């Protein structure tokens, strides 16, 4: 008989939860406090090195009357926050050019390519959300024009098209959208479909093993679970479509949820998928005033 | 009693006297991969004695112009010990940690010392500057080892986010006058239930001085700070030769 | 078939609107979703955690930015000199947009709830000294010296063991809700202005350095919440992404 | 409330013994929280920090004039007095006594002023 | 000796213009600096001890700011009284030096 093969003799995989979610649906209230003239018992006085936030309150501090406090939380959930379409994508269908000037254009998935949803996301390091897609296609002029397109989306080792031409747009299993520029935009759903739990923005590493040299360190912080396909958009024809045209592409999430807030970004963004900054044009998080003591 | 403690794992032992609460990073401490959660079906190793300790890895000094330095975990861990040796051994490898930050100064000394956990801490470069060149961080500034690396840019985090903000993840505060040691519990923070040790890093460890250290001539000029760090609850599966990288 | 007539709305494209969307992907199951530590179901969490204030948001080098993370208290002359002093309003430009709480109240318009902010002296420990740190109310001025802000809300801190305070600067507002106070007319919101003044001396003995600093951490209390989500006007960045 | 009105020779040619005499008015000497400093300024330049006196005694000097200067008080009388050996000609100047609180660069209030040029 | 360097040594401004004057020490005193006022042919005022506080009667117009190597004093509206000579005095070590001095006119 041993011992401490018996003492443990369970993996407990609880992950012991210091703390429980309190149903909070809205701001709490204000009980009547009076003068308190104590010792030993002193409220004000934190100690800010133990790590964690005041746990003061405002009847310790002052006299306060009793406020029913009836401010409902419920627009900072999650889905308050993030299920609001913006725009994730723009292509380029034009007829002269350099920029996808045959008919057709491939788009890789990613939301870091526009600031604003871009800082939005940031806020948390892993995120768990079924998409909600919609594309508003029109002329540079914001023309509505009679053109057929067809949207294509190729999962990671699908064949890409390469001409308006390509088999590839027979989507025999691929999903496929065929829309007129003159119907409304067109709205789909996209499921959660990472090999992970969650989209993370940020990946702490490298993809591959091997020795890291300088010729590939762009694969630093790349994480394929987040490639998840391109979309291809083609002008539905054999011959060269006789309108501009240029697809916005704007994505709201729904069925959210996050873990680990992150610091929000403060500095200029350069690149997708880097935290890449200018190191000579560092600014402050804020605005700056000319002495302490003065505002 | 709550400013004395001891920590005792494995055959390590650190005791503090001069000490603040400890947190245990969002609540949770570190446990093993449960069978619903698990995905991989060969049976995990777990020597529980011989990985799951007290490590130092090295001193740095904490000077009056500090800009700060960072670690990452788990690669601080990548070749000493046995947990080195599993780390290299095994393909997916898990565990949470205990992270101990120590600093001791005199009564006369003054200075503040933030001591954070930062999940997935990605490293951003400068840019070249002016914000034009598409760089990358080297292999030594992403993964320094051991050695950590000195920050340059400490009030973006050398990756464009305020460290102001910081506070926000697991932390504790170093305070001459108040405590001369921060200690952090970290579960296993990551989308997968295993991982690999050599190619991801799970989070980082940032040090970063606040409030500049100061002193009056004739007191020590020296004063280190050595990070220890007890992994808990350590798994690795996927056995094969060893490999470093 | 079933009659039905088109209403106005029809076609349009809400941003905000919450409907159902063609799946794309039929029969599909995603990954299980494991535990991961961290989750979070509000963004108020955020806001109840301490961040730190800039109160300092005087320098701008590229050199001198992290010296904006605390401001200094020295010996003065023992006349109730004036050591700090801000605006409490979060959603507005200077010391708040440091914090957590700021860059969250950047993406909604009306806020309420009381505010803390806890300092922390990160002086030596042979280092003692009393403070008066005084939350004004919108109408009053800045004072002019520590006999006018001791008339407001104000908490007299002792450095000691216990190296924090929490002023708890509680909601005293005419509204509800106050949308972000800014210059003009929206002023109108504003919160009142939290100064820090000497109430004692800082007092060394010999061989301690005659300066400290002190370090800034706000946060909200539980009583406090957002609404009518917006765009920030907070970073506005100036490019585009390559 | 306080006043500083020093007195001493105008002309005062080389090699002589440059003494002035500052006299507090309106106050004590002995107070424990003020030291009295004597300043120095060449005419048309800058000002220099000659030396403290306490009133116990203590003193802090300029390390340019540790040893060619004397600053003594009396509290008897309410009054210092600053004292310069081997005068020269870089030693003319504008002289003020000064209260001054230690560690804060405090200097206030001041004397009138007395200017001194070393001529035969 | 730790010496100071002010910039500029000399100015000209109009009335109701902010004046800014730099004075930077080569090692870090960190608070133990002032800032003094002199008129031609009288003695130097106390504008502000510490860096930071104004000596109470000096006009809220003048501020200092900084700590460590830098400091700045600055005149929010210059007035036609403000002409006048600014030095910078750092008491480091227990001695005491002042700056070069800058002589702000209209």
């Known amino acids: 008989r041993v011992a401490d093969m018996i003492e443990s003799s369970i993996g407990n995989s609880v992950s012991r939860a210091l703390t429980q979610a309190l149903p909070a649906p809205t701001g709490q209230n204000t009980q009547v406090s009076s003068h308190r003239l104590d010792t030993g018992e002193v409220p004000a006085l934190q100690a800010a090195e133990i790590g964690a936030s005041s746990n003061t309150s405002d009847e310790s501090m002052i006299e306060t009357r009793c406020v029913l406090n009836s401010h409902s939380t419920a627009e900072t959930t999650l889905d308050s926050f993030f299920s609001r379409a913006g725009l994730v994508g723009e292509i380029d269908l034009p007829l002269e050019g350099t920029t996808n000037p045959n008919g057709y254009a491939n788009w890789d998935i990613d939301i870091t390519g526009y600031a604003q949803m871009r800082r939005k996301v940031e806020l948390f390091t892993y995120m768990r959300f079924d998409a909600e897609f919609t594309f508003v296609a029109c002329t540079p002029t914001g023309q509505v024009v009679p053109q057929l397109l067809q949207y294509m989306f190729v999962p990671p080792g699908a064949p890409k098209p390469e001409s308006r031409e390509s088999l590839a747009w027979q989507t025999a299993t691929n999903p496929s959208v065929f829309v007129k520029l003159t119907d409304p935009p067109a709205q789909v759903s996209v499921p959660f479909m990472s090999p992970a739990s969650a989209y993370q923005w940020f990946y702490d590493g490298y993809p591959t093993f091997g020795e890291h040299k300088q010729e590939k360190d762009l694969e630093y912080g790349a994480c394929p679970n987040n490639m998840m396909g391109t979309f291809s958009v083609r002008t539905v024809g054999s011959s060269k479509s006789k309108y501009a045209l240029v697809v916005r592409i704007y994505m709201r999430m729904k069925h959210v949820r996050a873990w680990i807030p992150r610091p929000m970004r403060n500095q200029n963004y350069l690149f997708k998928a880097n935290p890449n900054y200018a190191g000579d044009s560092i600014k402050p998080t804020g605005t700056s005033r000319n002495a302490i003591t003065t505002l | 009693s709550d400013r004395v403690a001891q920590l005792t794992i494995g055959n390590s032992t650190i005791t503090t006297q001069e000490a603040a609460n400890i947190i245990v990073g969002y609540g949770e401490w570190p446990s093993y991969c449960s069978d619903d959660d698990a995905t991989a079906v060969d049976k995990p190793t777990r020597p529980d004695v011989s990985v799951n300790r007290f490590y130092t890895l090295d001193t740095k000094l904490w000077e009056k112009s500090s800009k700060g330095w960072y670690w990452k975990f788990p690669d601080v861990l990548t070749e000493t010990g046995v947990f080195g040796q599993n780390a290299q051994f095994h393909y997916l490898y898990r565990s949470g940690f205990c992270i101990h930050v120590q600093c001791n100064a005199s009564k006369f000394h003054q200075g503040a010392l933030l001591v954070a956990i930062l999940p997935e801490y990605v490293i951003g470069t400068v840019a070249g500057g002016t914000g034009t060149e598409d760089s990358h961080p080297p292999y030594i500034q992403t993964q320094p080892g051991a050695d950590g690396f000195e920050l340059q840019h400490p009030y973006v985090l050398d990756a464009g986010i305020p460290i102001s903000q910081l506070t926000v993840c697991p932390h504790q505060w170093i305070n001459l006058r108040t405590n001369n040691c921060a200690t952090i519990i970290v579960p296993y923070m990551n989308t997968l239930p295993f991982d690999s040790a050599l190619n991801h890093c799970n989070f980082g460890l940032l040090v970063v001085p606040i409030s500049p250290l100061d002193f009056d001539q004739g007191a020590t000029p020296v004063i280190p700070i050595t990070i220890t760090l007890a992994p808990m609850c350590s798994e690795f599966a996927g056995l094969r030769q060893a490999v470093t990288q | 078939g079933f009659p039905t007539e088109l209403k106005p709305g029809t076609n349009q494209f809400l941003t905000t609107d919450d409907g159902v969307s063609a799946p794309i992907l039929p029969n599909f199951h995603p990954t299980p979703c494991i535990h991961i530590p961290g989750e979070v179901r509000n963004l108020l969490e955020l806001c109840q955690v301490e961040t730190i204030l800039e109160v300092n948001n005087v320098p701008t080098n590229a050199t001198s930015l992290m010296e904006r993370l605390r401001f200094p208290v020295s010996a003065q002359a023992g006349k109730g000199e004036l050591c700090a002093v801000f605006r409490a309003d979060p959603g507005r430009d200077g010391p708040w947009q440091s914090t957590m709480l700021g860059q969250l109240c950047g993406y909604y318009t009306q806020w309420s709830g009381s505010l803390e902010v806890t300092f922390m002296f990160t002086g030596s420990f042979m280092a003692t000294g009393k403070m008066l740190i005084a939350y004004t109310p919108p109408g009053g001025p800045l004072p002019k010296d520590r006999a006018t802000a001791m008339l407001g809300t104000h908490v007299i801190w002792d450095f000691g063991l216990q190296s924090s305070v929490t002023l708890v600067i509680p909601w005293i507002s005419n509204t509800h809700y106050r949308a972000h106070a800014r210059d003009g007319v929206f002023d109108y919101y504003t919160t009142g202005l939290v100064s820090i003044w000497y109430q004692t001396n800082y007092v060394v003995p010999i061989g301690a350095p005659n300066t400290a600093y002190i370090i800034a951490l706000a946060a909200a209390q539980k009583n406090f919440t957002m609404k009518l989500c917006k765009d920030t006007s907070h970073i506005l960045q100036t490019a585009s992404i390559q | 409330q306080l006043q500083l009105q020093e007195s001493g020779p105008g002309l005062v040619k080389p090699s002589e013994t440059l003494s002035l005499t500052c006299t507090v008015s309106?106050?004590?000497?002995?107070?424990?929280?003020?030291?009295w400093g004597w300043i120095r300024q060449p005419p048309g330049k800058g000002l220099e920090w000659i030396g403290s006196?306490?009133?116990?005694?203590?003193?802090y000097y300029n390390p340019s004039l540790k040893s060619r200067v004397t600053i003594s008080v009396d509290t008897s009388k309410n009054q210092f007095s600053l004292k310069l050996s081997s005068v020269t000609a870089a030693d003319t100047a504008v002289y003020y006594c000064?209260?001054?609180?230690?560690?804060?660069?405090?200097?206030?209030?001041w004397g009138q002023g007395t200017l001194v040029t070393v001529s035969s | 000796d730790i010496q100071m360097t002010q910039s500029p040594s000399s100015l000209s401004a109009s009335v109701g213009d902010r004046v800014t004057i730099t004075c930077r020490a080569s090692?870090?005193?960190?608070?133990?600096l002032g800032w003094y006022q002199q008129k031609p042919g009288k003695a130097p005022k106390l504008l502000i001890y510490?860096?930071?506080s104004l000596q109470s009667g000096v006009p809220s117009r003048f501020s200092g700011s900084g700590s460590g190597t830098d400091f700045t004093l600055t005149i929010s509206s210059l007035q036609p009284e403000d002409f006048a000579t600014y030095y910078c005095?750092?008491?480091?070590?227990?001695?005491?030096?002042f700056g070069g001095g800058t002589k702000v006119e209209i």
């Open positions: 000064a209260r001054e609180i230690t560690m804060i660069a405090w200097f206030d209030p």
């Open positions: 309106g106050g004590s000497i002995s107070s424990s929280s003020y030291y």
């Open positions: 006196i306490y009133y116990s005694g203590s003193t």
């Open positions: 090692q870090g005193i960190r608070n133990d």
């Open positions: 510490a860096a930071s």
């Open positions: 005095l750092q008491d480091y070590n227990y001695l005491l030096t």
